[PDB]
Coordinates of C-alpha atoms in Angstrom, one line a residue:
Chain A
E27 CA -12.0 -10.1 9.4
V28 CA -12.7 -7.8 6.4
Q29 CA -13.5 -10.3 3.6
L30 CA -14.0 -9.0 0.0
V31 CA -14.6 -11.6 -2.7
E32 CA -15.7 -10.7 -6.2
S33 CA -16.8 -12.3 -9.4
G34 CA -17.9 -11.7 -13.0
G35 CA -14.3 -12.2 -14.0
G36 CA -14.3 -13.8 -17.5
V37 CA -14.6 -13.0 -21.2
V38 CA -16.2 -10.3 -23.3
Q39 CA -15.9 -9.0 -26.8
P40 CA -15.0 -5.3 -27.0
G41 CA -18.0 -3.0 -27.5
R42 CA -20.0 -5.6 -25.5
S43 CA -20.3 -5.3 -21.8
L44 CA -20.1 -7.1 -18.4
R45 CA -20.0 -6.2 -14.8
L46 CA -18.2 -7.3 -11.6
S47 CA -19.7 -7.9 -8.2
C48 CA -17.7 -7.4 -5.0
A49 CA -19.4 -9.1 -2.1
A50 CA -18.7 -7.7 1.4
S51 CA -18.3 -9.4 4.7
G52 CA -16.9 -9.0 8.2
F53 CA -17.2 -5.2 8.3
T54 CA -19.9 -2.5 8.1
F55 CA -20.4 -2.0 4.4
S56 CA -21.9 1.4 5.3
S57 CA -18.8 2.4 7.3
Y58 CA -17.3 4.1 4.3
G59 CA -17.2 3.9 0.5
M60 CA -15.3 1.8 -2.0
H61 CA -13.0 2.0 -5.0
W62 CA -12.3 -0.4 -7.8
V63 CA -8.6 -0.6 -8.8
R64 CA -7.5 -2.3 -12.0
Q65 CA -4.2 -4.1 -12.5
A66 CA -3.2 -5.0 -16.1
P67 CA -1.5 -8.5 -16.1
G68 CA 1.9 -7.9 -14.6
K69 CA 1.7 -4.1 -14.9
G70 CA 1.2 -1.1 -12.6
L71 CA -1.9 -0.6 -10.5
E72 CA -4.5 1.7 -12.1
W73 CA -7.1 3.4 -10.0
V74 CA -10.6 3.1 -11.6
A75 CA -13.4 4.7 -9.6
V76 CA -14.9 5.5 -6.2
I77 CA -18.4 5.3 -4.8
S78 CA -19.4 7.0 -1.6
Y79 CA -20.6 6.1 1.9
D80 CA -24.2 6.8 0.8
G81 CA -24.2 5.7 -2.8
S82 CA -24.6 9.4 -4.0
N83 CA -21.1 10.5 -5.1
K84 CA -18.8 8.8 -7.7
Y85 CA -15.5 9.8 -9.2
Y86 CA -14.1 7.8 -12.1
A87 CA -10.8 7.8 -14.0
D88 CA -10.7 9.6 -17.3
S89 CA -10.1 6.3 -19.0
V90 CA -13.5 5.0 -17.7
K91 CA -15.6 8.3 -17.7
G92 CA -18.0 7.5 -20.5
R93 CA -18.2 3.7 -20.7
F94 CA -17.9 2.4 -17.1
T95 CA -20.2 2.9 -14.1
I96 CA -19.9 2.0 -10.4
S97 CA -22.7 1.1 -8.0
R98 CA -23.2 -0.7 -4.7
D99 CA -26.0 -2.4 -2.7
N100 CA -26.0 -1.3 0.9
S101 CA -28.6 -3.9 1.8
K102 CA -27.0 -7.1 0.6
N103 CA -23.6 -5.5 1.2
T104 CA -22.2 -5.6 -2.4
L105 CA -20.4 -3.3 -4.8
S106 CA -20.6 -3.6 -8.6
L107 CA -18.7 -2.0 -11.5
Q108 CA -20.5 -2.2 -14.8
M109 CA -18.3 -1.8 -17.9
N110 CA -20.0 -1.1 -21.2
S111 CA -17.9 -0.5 -24.3
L112 CA -14.8 -2.4 -23.3
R113 CA -11.5 -1.7 -25.0
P114 CA -8.7 -4.3 -25.0
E115 CA -6.9 -1.7 -22.9
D116 CA -9.4 -2.8 -20.2
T117 CA -8.0 -6.3 -20.0
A118 CA -6.9 -6.7 -16.4
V119 CA -7.7 -8.1 -13.1
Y120 CA -9.8 -5.9 -10.9
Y121 CA -10.0 -5.2 -7.2
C122 CA -12.5 -3.6 -4.8
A123 CA -11.0 -1.5 -2.1
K124 CA -12.0 -0.2 1.4
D125 CA -11.2 3.4 2.1
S126 CA -9.7 2.7 5.6
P127 CA -10.1 5.8 7.9
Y128 CA -6.9 7.9 7.5
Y129 CA -7.6 11.1 9.3
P130 CA -7.6 10.6 2.7
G131 CA -7.4 7.1 1.3
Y132 CA -5.0 4.3 2.1
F133 CA -6.6 1.0 0.8
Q134 CA -5.7 -1.6 3.4
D135 CA -8.4 -4.1 2.5
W136 CA -8.3 -5.6 -1.0
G137 CA -10.3 -8.3 -2.8
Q138 CA -8.4 -11.4 -4.1
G139 CA -9.0 -10.0 -7.6
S140 CA -11.0 -11.1 -10.7
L141 CA -9.8 -11.1 -14.3
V142 CA -11.5 -9.5 -17.2
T143 CA -10.1 -11.0 -20.4
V144 CA -11.5 -9.2 -23.5
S145 CA -10.5 -11.7 -26.2
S146 CA -13.1 -12.9 -28.6
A147 CA -12.2 -16.5 -27.9
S148 CA -14.5 -19.4 -27.1
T149 CA -14.4 -19.8 -23.3
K150 CA -12.6 -23.2 -23.1
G151 CA -11.8 -25.4 -20.1
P152 CA -8.5 -27.2 -19.7
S153 CA -7.2 -30.6 -20.7
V154 CA -5.0 -31.4 -17.8
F155 CA -2.3 -34.0 -18.0
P156 CA 0.0 -35.8 -15.4
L157 CA 3.7 -35.5 -15.0
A158 CA 4.9 -38.9 -13.8
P159 CA 8.2 -39.0 -11.8
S160 CA 11.2 -39.4 -14.0
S161 CA 12.8 -42.8 -13.5
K162 CA 16.1 -41.2 -12.3
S163 CA 14.6 -38.6 -10.1
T164 CA 13.5 -41.7 -8.1
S165 CA 17.2 -42.9 -8.1
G166 CA 18.1 -40.1 -5.7
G167 CA 17.0 -38.6 -2.3
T168 CA 14.0 -36.7 -3.6
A169 CA 11.5 -37.0 -6.5
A170 CA 9.7 -34.7 -9.0
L171 CA 6.0 -34.8 -9.9
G172 CA 3.3 -32.6 -11.2
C173 CA 0.3 -31.7 -13.2
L174 CA 0.1 -30.0 -16.7
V175 CA -3.0 -27.8 -17.2
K176 CA -3.4 -27.3 -21.0
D177 CA -5.4 -25.5 -23.6
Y178 CA -7.8 -23.6 -21.5
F179 CA -9.1 -20.0 -21.7
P180 CA -9.2 -17.6 -19.9
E181 CA -6.9 -17.3 -16.9
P182 CA -6.9 -18.3 -14.0
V183 CA -6.9 -21.8 -12.6
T184 CA -7.4 -22.8 -9.0
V185 CA -4.7 -25.4 -8.4
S186 CA -4.1 -27.6 -5.3
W187 CA -2.5 -30.9 -4.6
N188 CA -4.2 -33.8 -2.7
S189 CA -7.4 -31.9 -2.3
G190 CA -5.6 -28.8 -1.0
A191 CA -3.3 -30.7 1.4
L192 CA 0.2 -30.4 -0.2
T193 CA 0.9 -26.6 -0.3
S194 CA 4.3 -27.3 1.3
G195 CA 7.1 -28.6 -0.8
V196 CA 5.5 -27.2 -4.0
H197 CA 4.9 -24.3 -6.2
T198 CA 3.1 -23.6 -9.5
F199 CA 4.2 -22.1 -12.8
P200 CA 2.6 -18.9 -14.2
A201 CA 0.5 -18.8 -17.3
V202 CA 2.0 -18.9 -20.8
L203 CA -0.1 -17.7 -23.8
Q204 CA 0.3 -20.3 -26.5
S205 CA 0.3 -19.3 -30.2
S206 CA -3.3 -20.5 -30.4
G207 CA -4.6 -17.9 -27.9
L208 CA -4.9 -20.9 -25.5
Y209 CA -3.3 -21.0 -22.0
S210 CA -1.3 -23.7 -20.2
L211 CA 1.0 -24.2 -17.2
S212 CA 2.2 -26.8 -14.8
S213 CA 2.4 -27.4 -11.0
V214 CA 5.1 -29.5 -9.4
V215 CA 6.1 -30.9 -6.0
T216 CA 9.0 -32.0 -3.9
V217 CA 8.2 -35.5 -2.5
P218 CA 9.8 -38.3 -0.7
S219 CA 11.4 -40.6 -3.3
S220 CA 10.1 -43.9 -1.9
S221 CA 6.6 -42.6 -0.9
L222 CA 4.9 -43.3 -4.3
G223 CA 4.3 -46.9 -3.3
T224 CA 1.8 -45.8 -0.6
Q225 CA 0.9 -42.2 -1.4
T226 CA -1.4 -41.6 -4.3
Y227 CA -1.2 -37.9 -5.2
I228 CA -3.8 -36.0 -7.3
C229 CA -4.5 -32.6 -8.8
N230 CA -7.2 -30.5 -7.0
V231 CA -7.8 -28.0 -9.8
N232 CA -10.8 -26.1 -11.3
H233 CA -11.4 -23.6 -14.1
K234 CA -14.1 -21.2 -12.9
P235 CA -15.3 -19.6 -16.2
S236 CA -15.9 -23.0 -17.8
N237 CA -17.4 -24.7 -14.7
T238 CA -14.5 -27.3 -14.9
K239 CA -13.1 -29.4 -12.1
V240 CA -10.8 -32.4 -12.8
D241 CA -8.7 -34.7 -10.6
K242 CA -5.6 -36.3 -12.0
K243 CA -3.9 -39.0 -9.9
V244 CA -0.3 -39.3 -10.9
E245 CA 1.2 -42.9 -11.2
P246 CA 4.9 -43.7 -11.2
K247 CA 5.7 -45.1 -14.7
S248 CA 9.1 -46.6 -14.3
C249 CA 9.2 -49.7 -16.7
Chain B
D6 CA -5.0 13.4 -13.0
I7 CA -1.8 13.8 -10.9
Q8 CA 0.9 11.2 -11.6
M9 CA 3.3 9.7 -9.2
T10 CA 6.8 9.1 -10.6
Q11 CA 8.4 6.5 -8.5
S12 CA 12.1 5.5 -8.9
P13 CA 14.1 3.5 -9.5
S14 CA 12.3 1.4 -12.1
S15 CA 13.7 -1.9 -10.8
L16 CA 16.2 -3.1 -8.2
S17 CA 18.5 -6.1 -8.1
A18 CA 19.7 -5.6 -4.5
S19 CA 20.8 -8.5 -2.2
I20 CA 20.5 -9.6 1.5
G21 CA 20.9 -7.0 4.2
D22 CA 21.1 -4.1 1.8
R23 CA 19.7 -0.7 2.9
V24 CA 18.1 0.2 -0.4
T25 CA 15.7 3.1 -1.0
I26 CA 12.9 3.9 -3.4
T27 CA 11.6 7.4 -4.1
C28 CA 8.4 8.9 -5.4
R29 CA 8.0 12.3 -7.2
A30 CA 4.7 14.1 -7.2
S31 CA 3.0 16.3 -9.9
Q32 CA 1.9 18.7 -7.1
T33 CA 2.2 19.4 -3.4
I34 CA 0.4 16.3 -1.9
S35 CA 1.8 17.0 1.5
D36 CA 1.6 13.7 3.5
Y37 CA -1.4 11.8 2.0
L38 CA 0.7 9.1 0.4
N39 CA 0.8 5.3 0.6
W40 CA 3.2 2.5 -0.2
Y41 CA 2.0 -1.0 -1.0
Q42 CA 4.1 -4.1 -1.2
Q43 CA 2.7 -6.5 -3.8
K44 CA 3.8 -10.0 -3.2
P45 CA 3.3 -11.0 -6.8
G46 CA 0.3 -13.0 -8.1
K47 CA -1.6 -11.9 -5.0
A48 CA -3.3 -8.7 -4.1
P49 CA -1.3 -5.6 -2.9
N50 CA -0.5 -5.7 0.8
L51 CA -0.4 -2.3 2.6
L52 CA 2.8 -0.8 3.8
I53 CA 2.6 2.8 5.0
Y54 CA 0.4 5.8 5.4
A55 CA 1.4 9.5 6.1
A56 CA 4.6 8.1 4.4
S57 CA 5.9 7.9 7.9
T58 CA 3.8 5.5 10.1
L59 CA 3.7 1.7 10.0
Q60 CA 0.7 -0.4 10.2
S61 CA 0.9 -2.9 13.1
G62 CA 1.9 -6.4 11.9
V63 CA 4.1 -4.8 9.2
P64 CA 7.8 -5.2 10.3
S65 CA 9.7 -2.1 11.5
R66 CA 12.6 -2.2 9.1
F67 CA 10.4 -0.2 6.7
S68 CA 9.8 3.5 6.8
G69 CA 9.7 6.7 4.7
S70 CA 9.8 10.4 4.8
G71 CA 9.0 13.5 2.7
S72 CA 6.5 16.3 3.1
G73 CA 5.9 17.5 -0.5
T74 CA 6.7 16.4 -4.0
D75 CA 9.4 13.9 -3.0
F76 CA 9.2 10.9 -0.6
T77 CA 11.3 8.0 0.5
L78 CA 10.9 4.3 1.3
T79 CA 13.5 3.2 3.9
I80 CA 14.2 -0.6 4.1
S81 CA 17.0 -1.2 6.5
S82 CA 17.9 -4.9 6.2
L83 CA 16.5 -7.0 3.4
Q84 CA 15.4 -10.6 3.8
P85 CA 14.0 -12.8 0.9
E86 CA 10.6 -12.0 2.4
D87 CA 10.7 -8.5 0.9
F88 CA 10.7 -9.8 -2.6
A89 CA 7.8 -8.0 -4.3
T90 CA 6.9 -5.0 -6.4
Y91 CA 6.5 -1.8 -4.4
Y92 CA 4.0 0.8 -5.3
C93 CA 3.1 4.5 -4.6
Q94 CA -0.3 6.2 -4.3
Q95 CA -1.5 9.7 -3.2
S96 CA -4.5 9.8 -0.9
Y97 CA -4.6 13.6 -1.1
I98 CA -6.5 14.0 -4.4
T99 CA -9.1 11.9 -6.2
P100 CA -8.2 10.2 -8.6
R101 CA -5.8 8.3 -6.3
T102 CA -3.5 7.3 -9.1
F103 CA -0.3 5.2 -8.6
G104 CA 3.3 5.1 -9.4
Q105 CA 4.9 2.9 -12.1
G106 CA 5.9 0.3 -9.5
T107 CA 9.4 -1.0 -8.5
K108 CA 10.5 -4.6 -8.2
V109 CA 13.2 -5.8 -5.8
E110 CA 15.7 -8.8 -5.9
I111 CA 18.1 -10.4 -3.4
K112 CA 20.9 -13.0 -3.2
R113 CA 24.5 -12.5 -2.4
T114 CA 25.3 -16.0 -3.8
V115 CA 24.7 -18.0 -7.0
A116 CA 23.0 -21.4 -7.1
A117 CA 22.9 -24.0 -9.9
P118 CA 19.7 -25.7 -11.2
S119 CA 18.6 -29.3 -10.8
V120 CA 16.9 -30.2 -14.1
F121 CA 14.2 -32.9 -14.5
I122 CA 12.5 -33.9 -17.7
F123 CA 8.9 -35.2 -18.2
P124 CA 7.8 -37.1 -21.3
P125 CA 4.2 -36.9 -22.7
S126 CA 1.6 -38.8 -20.8
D127 CA -0.2 -41.6 -22.5
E128 CA -3.3 -39.5 -21.8
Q129 CA -2.1 -36.7 -24.1
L130 CA -0.6 -38.9 -26.8
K131 CA -4.1 -40.4 -27.2
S132 CA -5.3 -36.8 -27.5
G133 CA -3.2 -36.5 -30.7
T134 CA -0.6 -34.0 -29.3
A135 CA 2.6 -34.5 -27.4
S136 CA 4.3 -32.1 -25.0
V137 CA 7.7 -32.5 -23.3
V138 CA 8.5 -30.6 -20.1
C139 CA 11.9 -29.5 -18.8
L140 CA 12.0 -28.1 -15.3
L141 CA 14.9 -26.2 -13.6
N142 CA 14.6 -26.2 -9.8
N143 CA 16.4 -24.1 -7.2
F144 CA 18.6 -21.7 -9.1
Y145 CA 19.9 -18.1 -9.0
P146 CA 20.1 -15.9 -11.0
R147 CA 16.9 -16.3 -13.0
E148 CA 18.6 -15.7 -16.4
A149 CA 19.3 -19.2 -17.6
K150 CA 18.6 -20.5 -21.1
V151 CA 17.3 -23.9 -22.1
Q152 CA 17.5 -25.4 -25.6
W153 CA 15.4 -28.2 -26.9
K154 CA 17.1 -30.9 -29.0
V155 CA 14.9 -33.3 -30.9
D156 CA 17.1 -36.1 -32.3
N157 CA 20.1 -33.9 -31.6
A158 CA 18.5 -31.0 -33.7
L159 CA 17.9 -27.6 -32.2
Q160 CA 14.4 -26.1 -32.0
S161 CA 12.9 -22.6 -32.3
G162 CA 9.4 -21.4 -31.7
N163 CA 8.5 -24.9 -30.7
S164 CA 8.5 -24.1 -27.0
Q165 CA 7.8 -21.5 -24.4
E166 CA 8.9 -21.2 -20.8
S167 CA 7.6 -19.7 -17.5
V168 CA 9.9 -18.6 -14.7
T169 CA 8.4 -18.5 -11.2
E170 CA 9.1 -15.4 -9.1
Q171 CA 11.7 -15.6 -6.4
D172 CA 11.2 -18.0 -3.5
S173 CA 11.2 -16.5 0.0
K174 CA 13.3 -18.9 2.0
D175 CA 16.2 -19.9 -0.2
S176 CA 15.6 -17.2 -2.7
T177 CA 16.1 -19.3 -5.9
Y178 CA 13.8 -19.5 -8.9
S179 CA 12.3 -22.3 -11.0
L180 CA 11.4 -22.3 -14.7
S181 CA 9.8 -24.8 -17.0
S182 CA 10.0 -25.0 -20.8
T183 CA 7.3 -26.9 -22.7
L184 CA 8.1 -28.5 -26.1
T185 CA 4.9 -29.5 -28.0
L186 CA 4.4 -31.3 -31.3
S187 CA 1.6 -33.6 -32.7
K188 CA 1.6 -37.3 -32.1
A189 CA 2.5 -37.8 -35.8
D190 CA 5.7 -35.8 -35.9
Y191 CA 6.5 -36.6 -32.2
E192 CA 6.5 -40.2 -33.4
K193 CA 9.0 -39.0 -36.1
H194 CA 11.8 -38.9 -33.6
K195 CA 13.1 -41.1 -30.8
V196 CA 15.3 -39.0 -28.4
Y197 CA 14.3 -35.7 -26.8
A198 CA 16.5 -33.4 -24.7
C199 CA 16.8 -30.0 -23.1
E200 CA 20.3 -28.6 -22.7
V201 CA 20.7 -25.9 -20.0
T202 CA 23.2 -23.1 -19.6
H203 CA 23.7 -21.3 -16.3
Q204 CA 26.2 -19.2 -14.6
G205 CA 26.4 -21.8 -11.9
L206 CA 26.5 -24.7 -14.4
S207 CA 30.2 -25.4 -14.9
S208 CA 29.4 -26.7 -18.4
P209 CA 26.0 -27.2 -20.1
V210 CA 23.8 -30.0 -18.8
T211 CA 21.2 -32.0 -20.8
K212 CA 18.5 -34.3 -19.6
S213 CA 17.1 -36.7 -22.2
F214 CA 15.0 -39.8 -22.8
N215 CA 14.0 -42.2 -25.6
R216 CA 10.3 -42.9 -26.0
Chain C
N23 CA 4.6 52.2 39.9
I24 CA 1.4 50.5 38.8
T25 CA -0.6 48.7 41.6
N26 CA -3.0 45.9 40.8
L27 CA -2.1 42.3 40.3
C28 CA -2.2 40.6 36.8
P29 CA -4.4 37.5 36.8
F30 CA -2.5 34.7 35.0
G31 CA -4.6 31.9 36.5
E32 CA -7.6 32.8 34.4
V33 CA -5.4 31.3 31.6
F34 CA -3.1 28.8 33.4
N35 CA -5.4 26.7 35.6
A36 CA -8.4 27.6 33.4
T37 CA -11.1 25.0 33.9
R38 CA -11.3 24.7 30.1
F39 CA -8.8 25.6 27.4
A40 CA -9.3 26.7 23.8
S41 CA -9.0 24.6 20.7
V42 CA -5.9 25.1 18.5
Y43 CA -7.1 27.1 15.4
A44 CA -9.2 29.4 17.6
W45 CA -6.5 29.9 20.2
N46 CA -7.4 32.0 23.2
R47 CA -5.6 35.3 23.5
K48 CA -5.9 37.3 26.8
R49 CA -4.2 40.7 26.8
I50 CA -2.8 42.0 30.1
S51 CA -2.5 45.7 31.1
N52 CA -2.4 48.2 33.9
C53 CA -1.2 45.7 36.5
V54 CA 1.8 43.8 38.0
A55 CA 2.8 40.2 37.5
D56 CA 5.0 37.9 39.5
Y57 CA 6.3 35.4 36.9
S58 CA 8.1 33.4 39.6
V59 CA 4.8 31.4 39.7
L60 CA 5.9 29.4 36.6
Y61 CA 9.6 28.9 36.4
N62 CA 9.7 27.3 39.8
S63 CA 6.5 25.3 39.4
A64 CA 7.1 21.6 38.7
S65 CA 3.6 21.2 37.1
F66 CA 5.0 22.4 33.7
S67 CA 6.8 19.8 31.6
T68 CA 8.1 22.0 28.8
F69 CA 8.9 25.6 29.2
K70 CA 11.0 27.8 26.9
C71 CA 12.1 31.5 26.9
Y72 CA 12.8 33.2 23.6
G73 CA 14.9 36.3 23.9
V74 CA 13.5 37.0 27.4
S75 CA 15.1 36.4 30.8
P76 CA 13.4 33.8 32.9
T77 CA 14.2 35.9 36.1
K78 CA 14.9 39.5 35.3
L79 CA 11.6 39.3 33.4
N80 CA 10.0 40.4 36.6
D81 CA 12.5 43.2 36.9
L82 CA 11.0 44.3 33.5
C83 CA 8.0 46.5 32.6
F84 CA 6.0 46.4 29.4
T85 CA 3.3 48.2 27.4
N86 CA 1.1 45.0 27.8
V87 CA 1.5 41.2 27.9
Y88 CA -0.3 38.8 25.6
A89 CA -0.8 35.3 27.1
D90 CA -2.1 32.8 24.4
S91 CA -3.8 29.6 25.3
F92 CA -4.8 26.4 23.4
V93 CA -4.4 22.6 23.5
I94 CA -2.5 20.4 21.0
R95 CA -1.2 16.8 20.9
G96 CA 2.2 15.7 22.0
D97 CA 4.4 15.2 19.0
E98 CA 3.5 18.8 17.9
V99 CA 4.1 20.5 21.2
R100 CA 7.4 21.6 19.7
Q101 CA 5.7 23.0 16.6
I102 CA 5.5 26.3 18.3
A103 CA 9.2 26.9 18.3
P104 CA 9.7 30.0 16.1
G105 CA 10.0 29.7 12.3
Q106 CA 8.9 26.1 12.2
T107 CA 6.8 24.0 9.9
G108 CA 4.2 21.2 10.2
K109 CA 0.5 21.0 10.4
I110 CA 0.3 23.5 13.3
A111 CA 2.6 26.5 12.6
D112 CA 1.8 26.3 8.9
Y113 CA -2.0 26.3 9.4
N114 CA -3.5 27.2 12.8
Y115 CA -0.9 28.8 15.1
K116 CA 2.4 30.4 14.1
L117 CA 5.0 32.4 16.0
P118 CA 7.3 34.6 13.8
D119 CA 11.0 34.0 13.5
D120 CA 11.7 37.2 15.4
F121 CA 9.8 36.0 18.4
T122 CA 10.2 37.5 21.9
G123 CA 8.3 35.6 24.6
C124 CA 7.7 32.3 26.4
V125 CA 6.2 28.9 25.6
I126 CA 4.8 26.7 28.4
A127 CA 3.2 23.2 28.1
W128 CA 2.2 20.3 30.3
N129 CA 0.2 17.0 30.1
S130 CA -3.6 17.4 30.0
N131 CA -4.4 13.7 29.6
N132 CA -5.3 14.1 33.3
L133 CA -8.0 16.7 32.3
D134 CA -8.7 17.0 28.6
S135 CA -8.8 13.3 27.7
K136 CA -11.6 10.8 28.5
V137 CA -12.5 7.3 27.4
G138 CA -14.1 7.0 24.0
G139 CA -12.2 10.1 22.9
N140 CA -12.3 13.8 23.5
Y141 CA -12.8 14.4 19.7
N142 CA -14.2 17.9 20.6
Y143 CA -10.6 19.3 20.4
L144 CA -9.9 19.9 16.7
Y145 CA -7.0 21.3 14.7
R146 CA -6.9 22.7 11.2
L147 CA -5.9 20.1 8.7
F148 CA -6.3 22.1 5.4
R149 CA -5.7 25.6 4.2
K150 CA -4.9 27.0 0.8
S151 CA -2.4 29.6 2.2
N152 CA 0.1 29.5 5.0
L153 CA -0.7 31.1 8.4
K154 CA 0.6 34.5 9.4
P155 CA 2.2 35.1 12.8
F156 CA -0.8 35.2 15.3
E157 CA -3.3 34.7 12.5
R158 CA -6.4 33.1 13.8
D159 CA -8.1 30.6 11.4
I160 CA -11.8 30.1 12.1
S161 CA -12.7 29.8 8.4
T162 CA -14.7 26.7 7.6
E163 CA -15.0 26.8 3.8
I164 CA -14.5 24.0 1.2
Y165 CA -10.8 23.2 0.9
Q166 CA -10.7 23.0 -2.8
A167 CA -8.3 20.2 -3.6
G168 CA -6.8 21.9 -6.7
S169 CA -8.7 20.1 -9.4
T170 CA -12.4 21.0 -9.4
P171 CA -14.7 23.8 -8.2
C172 CA -17.0 23.3 -5.3
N173 CA -19.9 24.7 -3.3
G174 CA -20.5 22.9 0.0
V175 CA -18.4 19.9 0.9
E176 CA -20.3 17.5 -1.4
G177 CA -18.2 14.5 -2.2
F178 CA -14.5 14.5 -3.0
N179 CA -11.8 17.1 -3.6
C180 CA -13.6 19.3 -1.2
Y181 CA -12.6 18.8 2.4
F182 CA -14.0 20.1 5.7
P183 CA -10.9 22.0 6.8
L184 CA -10.7 20.7 10.4
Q185 CA -10.0 17.4 12.1
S186 CA -10.7 16.1 15.6
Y187 CA -8.0 14.8 18.1
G188 CA -8.9 11.4 19.3
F189 CA -7.8 11.7 22.9
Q190 CA -8.0 8.3 24.4
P191 CA -6.2 8.0 27.8
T192 CA -4.5 4.8 26.8
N193 CA -3.0 6.5 23.7
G194 CA 0.7 7.3 23.8
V195 CA 2.2 10.6 24.7
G196 CA 2.8 11.9 21.2
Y197 CA -0.9 11.4 20.7
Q198 CA -1.9 12.7 24.1
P199 CA -3.2 16.2 24.9
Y200 CA -1.0 19.1 25.9
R201 CA -2.3 22.4 27.1
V202 CA -0.1 25.2 25.8
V203 CA 0.3 28.8 27.1
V204 CA 2.2 31.1 24.7
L205 CA 3.2 34.2 26.7
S206 CA 4.2 37.3 24.8
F207 CA 5.4 40.8 25.6
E208 CA 5.5 44.1 23.6
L209 CA 6.7 47.6 24.1
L210 CA 6.0 51.0 22.4
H211 CA 6.7 54.7 22.5
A212 CA 3.8 54.7 25.0
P213 CA 3.5 54.4 28.8
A214 CA 4.7 51.5 30.9
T215 CA 1.6 49.5 31.6
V216 CA 2.5 46.0 32.9
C217 CA 5.4 45.6 35.4
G218 CA 7.0 42.8 37.3
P219 CA 7.5 42.7 41.1
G220 CA 11.1 43.6 41.2
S221 CA 10.6 46.5 38.8
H222 CA 11.8 49.4 41.0

């Protein structure tokens, strides 16, 4: 199990700097070297840089030769990309990548990703709100319910229902940038119509860059 | 520096199709090429190396060919579980740049949306703002249009909507438009509605309420 | 006329074979040779003549015979058909289109493949130019990857030209080992030097 999680994803004003930290697990970090690869939000994949088996050799992309730098810790088994004079061009999620053997690249093992948002906006947590079941959705065979995560920044939001129990009969709705530079979205669920009189559903959500975690039970307002 | 030009740009194929994506190279990059299927919102999942060998666990209907500046991606029979954006990358040279990316659709048949509406919560009205939500569930194609009526009057720039990407079992979509005013001028009106137009909707359908 | 027997076995049941890019070439002269040993033998799996008789070969006489010897994987056993392309004929062993001779191959998983992997067999994986017919590549330089200069294989865009064959016995037949003997015959305005048995 090659696990690769990373953090540092957050906010930075251009010309100021930050760095990302890719933590390795379940494979010999010495086995071979890593790359960082950057995906603009809903755009193509852009290769960033490579560091070697033995921390000695690094290639970068011509976008990042001059203001970015890559490094790794072979002892605590972690990779790090430091990014100095950021440009709004650099806004993206980032991924660390294993150079799986290929007897020569072929990244099979990716990190979940971590988002660098370069807006000069105050890092704000959400103001989530419930979406009670509409009183005629409950007059049919099914029923509709959900959460409304509002006015946070920046992306993303960990979002689960019933403490991460209901990931069946659901799906969430991607981020929309409001006029205010704020973000918001909603998650919803297919449920049994007459199950709301015993079941008490709740939003398992959190906003990582504002240390926020909230839990919204949804009640069935009908009269 | 070498760029990978991968074509077509997008693709609206359907079930069972034998559709093919191609990748042009800036130089002779003989076999050190890779395809990755990015199930969206998640990280890219590997497809192929040498352009011609699987990776175990990846289903066999995929393959490719080419030994040069031009390569293929062979998908024999599409299921909704191929819905993704498919990428190209050359392992031969460093930088290992990528292609533009190519998206794929499905669905022989049309499906109509089931619309639900959601009024502002007491929680948010106490917060001084009010947002109304209109959800469309289980519909193909994804090009449907909602219109917010506030006391039978049409809105503009008072709402935004977000369409989820294609489901993988029934292959439909789901979008959600959010109409937001302040508690003051949300109290200025009584009836709120979203009217929906779809290919599958025989005639426009509106869901509404009175606060 | 000539009377001394040509030793093929020094190539064919040779205790150890060459590696691809440094293919073993043993010239034959001033002797006689009974090629029946091969085209009745069951031990060979693939065996092709190119412009030469299988049988009246041993009616024939030559100026000398060149028997080539090396070991490749399975799916490239065919890469030594004439005028062909792929990592082998392009890089480390090529017969010309106008080829006159014989190709012989057979499984060596029995011999040349052990557990862990007989990575000691290598092919050539990179080369700036193509390979000439019977050109022997034992050059080990940086393979400059076409973007940046290089001295010593330091880092990227500079590849060690060769590559091992992982020969595990459980591995399939396309990725098994295959000994290969590329026979070859030439003539000249110069005396007959190698005959067959039935060569009057």
